[PDB]
Design a protein around this ligand. Structure first.
Ligand SMILES: Nc1ncnc2c1ncn2[C@@H]1O[C@H](COP(=O)(O)OP(=O)(O)O)[C@@H](O)[C@H]1O
Ligand SMILES: Nc1ncnc2c1ncn2[C@@H]1O[C@H](COP(=O)(O)OP(=O)(O)O)[C@@H](O)[C@H]1O
Ligand SMILES: Nc1ncnc2c1ncn2[C@@H]1O[C@H](COP(=O)(O)OP(=O)(O)O)[C@@H](O)[C@H]1O
Ligand SMILES: Nc1ncnc2c1ncn2[C@@H]1O[C@H](COP(=O)(O)OP(=O)(O)O)[C@@H](O)[C@H]1O
Ligand SMILES: OC[C@H]1O[C@H](O)[C@H](O)[C@@H](O)[C@@H]1O
Ligand SMILES: OC[C@H]1O[C@H](O)[C@H](O)[C@@H](O)[C@@H]1O
Ligand SMILES: [Ca+2]
Ligand SMILES: [Ca+2]
Ligand SMILES: [Ca+2]
Ligand SMILES: [Ca+2]
Ligand SMILES: [K+]
Ligand SMILES: [K+]
Ligand SMILES: [K+]
Ligand SMILES: [K+]
Ligand SMILES: [K+]
Ligand SMILES: [Zn+2]
Ligand SMILES: [Zn+2]
Ligand SMILES: [Zn+2]
Ligand SMILES: [Zn+2]
Lengths: 547, 376, 547, 376
């Protein structure tokens, strides 16, 4: 806006120069009978407006004096007054204001399209923003907290809009209809308010982070396209790690046709072994769709070594998972898990361990305001003897799940020093503490920030097939001998059936190809894993038989 | 003010020009025997004070040199020093004390007349201002809270004054005597203070919004012209909608309004159940079940199944929406009457499953509006 | 500092002008054989430094060119660079800093003498400062609260120093030794800390406002020259006003020789009557040393009318006060005083009423943290029925003493409307509410702010005879017939005895002259009231008999 | 940095001058057949770019006019626009971001070496810095509290960094690897976090101040080189002074230090009485009389009459002074040992009536000082 005003002024200046130069020649002629060239006219007019004033060309008439004077004042006005004033008002004042006084962004420009609206800032969403700023996605966080909007604009890896997240006028200004996605990370009541409100304007996909798993149905009702029970998921993860030996954890039941389950490898026979050596696919009929270790979901190779901290992601039928549990097989007796911290996550961990069930003890300094189902040992786990008196000694595992990382580090530090034998699973509230938790002696660390972001991020990047894969089922099919040699693009499975190929695995290998390219040549006896509607899964073996 | 001093300066300049032009001609004549025209004196003086310096017209005498030096230094003092120092001191300084450091208005212009003072800004009064904008009144809201004065400075269809509502010196700079009307929407003790204070200065009509209907008489006594028991009115509105045996009405929220609702259902009578997360500080005529309506089995363990009606009356609209959603989810047909604290939430309450929605802001503003128009 | 730097620059500029002018003439001569005058030299040098450049006087030599150039650059540097920069750095930058950013005054300049140090800001001291700013006394308030020091510098009717009030380094910077007086209005422990600390530096008189009357001796021990029990005094004042009829309140016992007592006139026979009509001096032998009414301690005239709100200040012997109490004389039965608010002042009021004693009831919403001696009826006096249930009906008086003026107004409003008969005494925390308390129906209002300031102010203005009148006694003497006609300055009572004349009263009048001028002619039979040491009160009748 | 750009500009100017002076001579010659000296070219160019404009040397040709116009516009662009815009943009802007809006230091210069990091500023560490100033170390204190960073910016004999003490990215910009020593004076859990974090970057020696002596072992385990149990030391100091039957010692204040004092008197043994206004959150081996030592009969109703010694150990120095005064007032000769939290109060405690005064700041600093010098 300002460079235009700047150089539009330069246009006016230039036109003024020509005009005065032209009139200068006109007057020198008609008033004094002197002829000057165009260059002389420019030269004189510059000399005067610029106040150099050589004096080698002057008028002698009064009318020439009046004109010289007019041109002279014009220079003083348009080079010594307007120009610096224009500068101090179009450049300096705006900058000094924005740099001395926070001016809240109330509204998003009309043209904004395909942006990600973030409602409710916290470690999870802060980590999300940093993780997808590495992709340079357009993130707008929205807050109704003035002191917060300030703080977020100074280290702005993101634009901030200050406004009530539940006003439709605000949402309109945020251009929610034009938005790509929306993360709803407010309280459950505010989220409910937000979804209903956004839904009154648009059909933009909303991802809600629910604080109490029972409110999930309620938030879908309000209009959330996806609901993520973080504290439950986080508790579940502190849970599967706390047992002395690893154990299956069912993730998705895709109609009873295909199950997805995860298995931590600690304490299991598979620990220390390589994948093909453990022979899981051969003995279970399961598919290993990935090895999550060190924060990276990698694809399974035969020579890939499973460590105590590894976690297998598995897919197969209900009976194939039962075979795996037999191979493990039987849990050790007198398992006793101390869960320090009885907030939402601590509660979630205990609730997961009760699903099995595994004997646990909850400790917290205060009584839960939300839970009435769990008996808790009240005490400060930091003040001496409190853990001892709770029977920390006959414990086989400690989950340390406090809202404070330093306390978690300190507890992990102490427990591992007094009980070098037992399993220690620690909660990291920020990723800046994960390493020290390990250094303190924790066997595994669950990092809320990254886990939360990994989920939300994947729901975001796989959005184009998220609400597609929502209501749809993932299934597995033995590659029919008819296509033993043909390529994916040649078979044309999608325009006939409507399903997609998300995995191919070899008949006698633990090696699987994830999301195969259309030029992939299909081998004989191979096993396909597909995803599609519950009307395309039945119209598969039908349509594939017809053509 | 800035224009006058600036153009008063231009006048002094213009005088100084004519002065120097004339002295120039006078000296040129008497000192050097040269005759120059009036236009030549202007042109020369402009030429020298502007530092152009053509040099085509110069004195040759010492006295002419001395004069020329004086006019040169004048141009510098008055165009290159004072004029720019003028700019900065005169109107770059107002820009700092009004744009870099927030300066709240502590007084209205002496001649302010016909304005409606607002004491106690809230959804109701904010809705009132944004409702009567087509009549174009000058609404002035008054707060003694700096941060609130600051936030109300940008969100505007109204002016903000900052000072103690109960200070007579503050009300005078507010020009109460010349105001059209006062809306007193502070606490009952504060309103009483305000009325008595205003009544010591003037007879400006006051509309007081009262929290406890028993205090209505006291507020009229302090000097309020009208008294509006909004919470009683709002509660009566909810109770009316909850009905028009085995009839049982669940009233979630036992604040002042939910209380008014139950006070209403007492007269019918229709049996009800009050739930609140707190013991009431002002009431002890009603039996309340304590608990957070949001947490869990709280509503079930209060017996919300054999209820025939539900009134949602929390001071928080998102809570209201959430409860409405949850109740409509559990029981597809049970009559739900819901409270909207701000009119921004009215539609989501309906979308949540409510059968009728009482809109506090809209109801308050209408009463207050119809009181501002009909009384004045 | 800056105007000196400003015009010292103008000196350098001027010297530069002369120098260049002189050299200009020197060079025109020796380099070109041209002679110019001094005026021509000034004229040329100004023309060039100022960049006018007429061109009617130029050099032709190269050395003349070099010189013209040097002078030219000098003007650009010293009129176009230095001068505006010097301005933007000595004028603009300091102002913009002080006006955009609060710079705390850490220290008082060395030369500061005779200033009043204020430690502990509140309504009392805020009122004090405004009351003695009308005298233009030098007030420095000291605070260790940053956010407060800011707030006080914007509406500065006073300089603010930001610092720990108990650091001797701070006190040294405050120049406590050079100070006139010091008001110690911190907590009792901080005050104790302050006195001891100040006393380690100087002997500057300290006035301490004690929060708990029992700590008074403790604070004198620490070094306070004067101790003021505000809450006790304030309670006492709500107390003497709450009874249905006025009653003597003893103030000072000057060794048993002379007592000072105050008497509110409400309910007494003296109400409605004029002073000489009530004939108090004649019937009691007392002196009426003043009539406090409407915030003004006036002198008593015979025709002065006593109203229900008046308060007599009285002086005389123990027996003369007993005579007055008989004249009153006997209090009405079934007195019942409701005291709403049981903080320090409320407690003080009850404690005063117990000195008599008068039956009272204390009401408060919380239990006192400091008092264990008073039985209190717990309740919110605002929520309905609470007062009724307390038996507010058989009350003869209500003291309303809450920390909140609006609540006091509202209570006063309600009580007077439900009980138009009973005595209502209200507490005003700020003077901006005193009038409305009266308008609400209060019979008398005690204004903490003004009362506090009136006391502190008088201890300050009478400082030159405060620590003098501290340890000294005030006494009254019948004017001996020997001086029946002589003038004060002629008697020479001070250089003989050492006492002072602070009052003269006529033999058959209620008219008294306060602080008589030395030219006063003494009448026959008159009664003198004097003040002096307990060694000059005995060496009075001795020295006055000898000469 | 500002000097270089500024004087690099002067160089460009000087080049431009010589350039224009030479072109001037060249054009004057080839275009007009006039020969001018080098000095004449400087003088002319200075005359034109500076807008003086003597006019004694002017071209007569169009090409000479065009050139003169170019040099004139150059003077304006480079002396009346860029140079002043240079001033403001180059060093009037740093003045706003460093003097009108506080900018905390979030990182130390890359080459910072030999500095002592302070984590947890308090009277002890503040006394430590102001004590070792004669050795002239570069003390850097680190806070994660903005307002505290701000206040510590003015009160200085030390530098202030602002960031999370337990962030590895923050400790790296703090150049821990090249630091002389670290004083860890946060809470026990925070100290543990800090040690482990520092130990992942470097082997810089750490002196941790520990609150609960049982946690000493844990802190060494986390990586602290020395562990200092100050509160135990301070309490032992008080208990030593309270003594060197019917001996009974009143210990006012049952925080960590007063506890340490009583833990000390247990070993002798000398019977004592603890008074505190609160139940201890960390202790339950000692019996405590609850009450505020200041309020009233509290000390008498605890039996402070038959006490033979009194230890004042409150976290507040004015409270300590006040109690000492009151105790010395009641009993003229009873041994009183008093705690000074900051050394500013040591003398008033003595003036209050104390027999011995333990100065936390002075004792802490000496230990920490003698640990900084002797270990390094
Ligand atoms: N030292 C401690 N000992 C026992 N419990 C603690 C301690 N410190 C914190 N806690 C508890 O840990 C819980 C924190 O969990 P919270 O953040 O509130 O929910 P969530 O479990 O989902 O993270 C709190 O309830 C808190 O009381
Ligand atoms: N989740 C909740 N469950 C039960 N009561 C609630 C809940 N949230 C708010 N409330 C109650 O709503 C009341 C607010 O009262 P108020 O705004 O004065 O009028 P109303 O009668 O409409 O509730 C409070 O007493 C508060 O305790
Ligand atoms: N509505 C009320 N009903 C009863 N007591 C009240 C009410 N409001 C305030 N109070 C009490 O009045 C007392 C205020 O006195 P406070 O300022 O604390 O000491 P002081 O008596 O010296 O002024 C408080 O203890 C407070 O509890
Ligand atoms: N007026 C008081 N009466 C009794 N105890 C007090 C009083 N003021 C402070 N305290 C106590 O002093 C204690 C402070 O403990 P701390 O600073 O950790 O070390 P210390 O052992 O020296 O007291 C607190 O427990 C606090 O309750
Ligand atoms: O510059 C003025 C000019 O005006 C006309 O065009 C004349 O023809 C020309 O001779 C003259 O030079
Ligand atoms: O201005 C220069 C002057 O120098 C000497 O003083 C000469 O005597 C004088 O003739 C000349 O005018
Ligand atoms: Ca860390
Ligand atoms: Ca809404
Ligand atoms: Ca008032
Ligand atoms: Ca001190
Ligand atoms: K010329
Ligand atoms: K010229
Ligand atoms: K010029
Ligand atoms: K010029
Ligand atoms: K010129
Ligand atoms: Zn639970
Ligand atoms: Zn009720
Ligand atoms: Zn009491
Ligand atoms: Zn202990």
């Amino acid at each position: 806006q300002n460079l235009k005003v700047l150089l539009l002024y330069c246009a006016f200046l230039l036109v003024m120069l020509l005009a005065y130069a032209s009139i200068f020649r006109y007057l020198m002629w008609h008033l004094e009978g002197r002829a000057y060239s165009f260059m002389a006219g420019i030269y004189w007019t510059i000399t005067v407006m610029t106040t150099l004033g050589f004096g080698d060309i002057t008028f002698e008439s009064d009318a020439g004096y009046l004109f010289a004077s007019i041109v002279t004042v014009s220079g003083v006005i348009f080079l010594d007054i307007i120009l610096p004033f224009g500068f101090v008002s179009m450049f300096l004042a705006p900058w000094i204001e924005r740099r001395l006084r926070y001016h809240p962004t109330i509204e998003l420009p009309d043209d904004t399209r395909g942006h990600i609206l973030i409602f409710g800032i916290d470690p999870i969403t802060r980590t999300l923003i940093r993780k997808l700023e590495s992709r340079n996605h357009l993130f707008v966080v929205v807050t109704d907290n003035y002191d917060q909007a300030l703080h977020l604009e100074e280290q702005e890896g993101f634009k901030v809009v200050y406004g009530s997240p539940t006003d439709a006028h605000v949402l309109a200004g945020l251009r929610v209809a034009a938005a790509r996605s929306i993360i709803a990370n407010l309280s459950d009541p505010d989220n409910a308010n937000l979804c209903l409100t956004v839904r009154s304007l648009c059909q933009t996909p909303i991802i809600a982070v629910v604080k109490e798993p029972v409110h999930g149905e309620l938030l879908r009702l309000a209009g959330a396209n996806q609901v993520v029970p973080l504290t439950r998921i986080l508790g579940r993860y502190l849970g599967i790690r706390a047992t002395t030996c690893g154990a299956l954890a069912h993730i998705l039941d895709s109609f009873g046709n295909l199950q997805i389950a995860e298995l931590p490898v600690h304490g299991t026979p598979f620990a220390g072994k390589t994948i093909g050596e453990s022979g899981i696919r051969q003995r279970t009929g399961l598919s290993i769709i990935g090895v999550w270790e060190r924060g990276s979901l990698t694809t399974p190779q035969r020579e890939t070594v499973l460590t105590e901290q590894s976690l297998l992601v598995l897919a197969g039928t209900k009976s194939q998972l039962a075979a795996l549990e037999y191979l493990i097989g039987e849990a050790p007796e007198d398992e006793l898990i101390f869960i320090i911290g009885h907030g939402r996550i601590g509660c979630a961990a205990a609730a997961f361990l009760d699903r099995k069930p595994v004997p646990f003890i909850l400790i917290d300094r205060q009584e839960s305001p939300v839970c009435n189902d769990h008996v808790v040992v009240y005490g400060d786990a930091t003040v001496g003897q409190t853990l001892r008196q709770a029977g920390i000694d006959r414990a086989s595992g400690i989950i340390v799940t406090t809202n404070d990382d330093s306390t978690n580090i300190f507890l992990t530090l102490a427990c591992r020093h007094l009980h070098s034998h037992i399993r220690i699973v620690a909660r990291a509230n920020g990723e800046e503490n994960v390493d020290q938790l390990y250094a303190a002696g924790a066997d595994f660390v669950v990092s809320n920030a990254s886990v939360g972001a990994n989920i939300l991020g994947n729901l975001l990047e796989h959005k184009e097939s998220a609400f597609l894969s929502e209501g749809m089922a993932v299934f597995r099919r033995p590659l029919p001998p008819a296509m033993a040699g043909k390529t994916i693009a040649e078979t044309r499975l999608r325009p006939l059936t409507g399903c997609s190929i998300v995995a191919i695995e070899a008949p006698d290998r633990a090696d699987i190809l994830i999301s195969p390219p259309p030029e992939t040549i299909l081998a004989e006896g191979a096993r396909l894993i597909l995803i599609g509607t519950s009307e395309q899964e039945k119209t598969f073996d039908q349509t594939i038989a017809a053509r």
